[PDB]
Design a binder for these strands. Structure first.
Ligand code: DTP
Ligand code: CA
Ligand code: CA
Ligand code: CA
Length: 376
DNA sequence: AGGACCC
DNA sequence: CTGGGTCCT
């Protein structure tokens, strides 16, 4: 029935990993760059008007003193990311990854184990770690309040372990489901944690200013709702279900309307090892098959260095962008799976390549990616 | 093969 | 000119 879920959210992740590489970079305003953008920056740099996905042009004019590090190669971020997940997995085996720097953990059985280990006189001694959302009053005879507080204590232990063992700093939110844990984790940042008591749930969801701030509502869904005059959380909460189902489908409608009330019963899913892995690169222009072939050889070479890992891929995919995306995939021959690997995959990929683009007609590629999936 | 979503 | 991921239809 009732759950205790934690959402762990690392502060300025890439920037943070960079500062643990050469500590010297600490105290100095830092940006991590990918091509022409600062994808994330530390809190020093952020204070001076800098923010994520803001171009170097709009980033150097506010901070001529902005320091830039190249973060196109995700290798070290990916490795640290899995170290965080593994350390969280020690607490409870059910950990779900969301991108490289967020994890949900279902702390329910863990909370329960801790409580039944306590005695009656110890119950009254239970205290919160970190913030309580909305400064809401704790009631120690409320069993839900007690469970959530034990949650906050486990969350603090997680954050202390991450810091002591990995040198990483992060936020956590403790709440009754994933949506709410994720909404609450960011209330105090960086490097703090907040617990959401059930009485403050409506306050948390109405504190949002647009429905696009609801996790699960992306670009397409938001713009759709905007085309129906739905702007605030309360609008979505009170809008006609039937009309909603019509315009977006039964699945999306009922789910996201449920989310507008802070209700989310989706389980925390054990992520385990990844289901795919890819190497990607983008560029102003690719217009020759020989250019493409070389980039593809680069991506594949790098990708093969990772294909060792934990399992082998049985499918390969190639994606391109032009001017959404386009792609072709096919199985990987079993003698190739049995592991010079480079020669036939390139041939495989180029055939895949010619399937979408024809050599003897003009074309302008802006992105190339190779993906290994269907792993066994 | 493409859609939607996440960081 | 970002670099990756997830599941669904
Ligand atoms: N279009 C995008 N929308 C959202 N996130 C993106 C997008 N493109 C890339 N990202 C990724 C790249 C970075 O890893 C990350 C950027 O910062 P983010 O994950 O939101 O938190 P952060 O760790 O960088 O800082 P913090 O969480 O403390 O605010 O999101
Ligand atoms: Ca986040
Ligand atoms: Ca973060
Ligand atoms: Ca959203």
């Amino acid at each position: 029935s009732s759950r205790v879920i934690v959402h762990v959210d690392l502060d300025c992740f890439y920037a943070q990993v960079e500062m643990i590489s050469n500590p010297e970079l600490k105290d100095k305003p830092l940006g991590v760059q990918q091509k022409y953008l600062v994808v994330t920056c530390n809190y020093e740099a952020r204070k001076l008007g800098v923010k994520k996905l803001m171009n170097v042009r709009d980033a150097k004019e506010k901070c001529p003193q902005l320091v830039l590090v190249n973060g196109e190669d995700l290798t070290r971020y990916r490795e640290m990311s899995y170290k965080v997940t593994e350390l969280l997995e020690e607490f409870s085996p059910v950990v779900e990854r969301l991108g490289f720097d967020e994890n949900f953990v279902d702390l329910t059985e863990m909370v329960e184990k801790r409580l039944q280990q306590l005695q009656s006189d110890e119950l009254s001694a239970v205290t919160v770690s970190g913030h309580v959302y909305n400064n809401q009053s704790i009631n120690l005879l409320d069993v839900l309040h007690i469970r959530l507080l034990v949650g906050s204590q486990i969350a603090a232990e997680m954050r202390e372990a991450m810091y002591n063992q990995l040198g990483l700093t992060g936020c956590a939110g403790v709440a009754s489901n994933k949506l709410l844990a994720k909404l609450v984790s960011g209330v105090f940042k960086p490097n703090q944690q907040t617990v959401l008591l059930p009485e403050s749930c409506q306050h948390l969801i109405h504190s949002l200013n647009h429905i696009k701030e609801i996790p699960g509502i992306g670009y397409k869904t938001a713009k759709c709702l905007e085309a129906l005059g739905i702007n605030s959380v309360r609008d979505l909460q009170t809008f006609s279900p039937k009309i909603l189902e019509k315009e977006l489908g039964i699945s999306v409608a009922q789910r996201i309307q449920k989310l507008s009330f802070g209700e989310d019963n989706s389980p925390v899913i054990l992520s385990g090892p990844p289901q795919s892995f890819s190497e990607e690169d983008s560029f102003k222009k690719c217009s020759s098959e020989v250019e493409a072939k070389n980039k593809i050889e680069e991506l594949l070479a790098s990708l093969l260095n990772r294909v060792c890992q934990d399992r082998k891929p049985h499918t390969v995919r190639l994606i391109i962008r032009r001017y959404g995306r386009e792609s072709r995939q096919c199985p990987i021959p079993s003698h190739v799976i049995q592991k010079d690997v480079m020669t036939p995959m390139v041939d495989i990929l180029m055939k895949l390549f010619r399937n979408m683009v024809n050599v003897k007609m003009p074309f302008h590629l802006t992105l190339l990616s190779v993906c290994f999936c269907n792993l066994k």
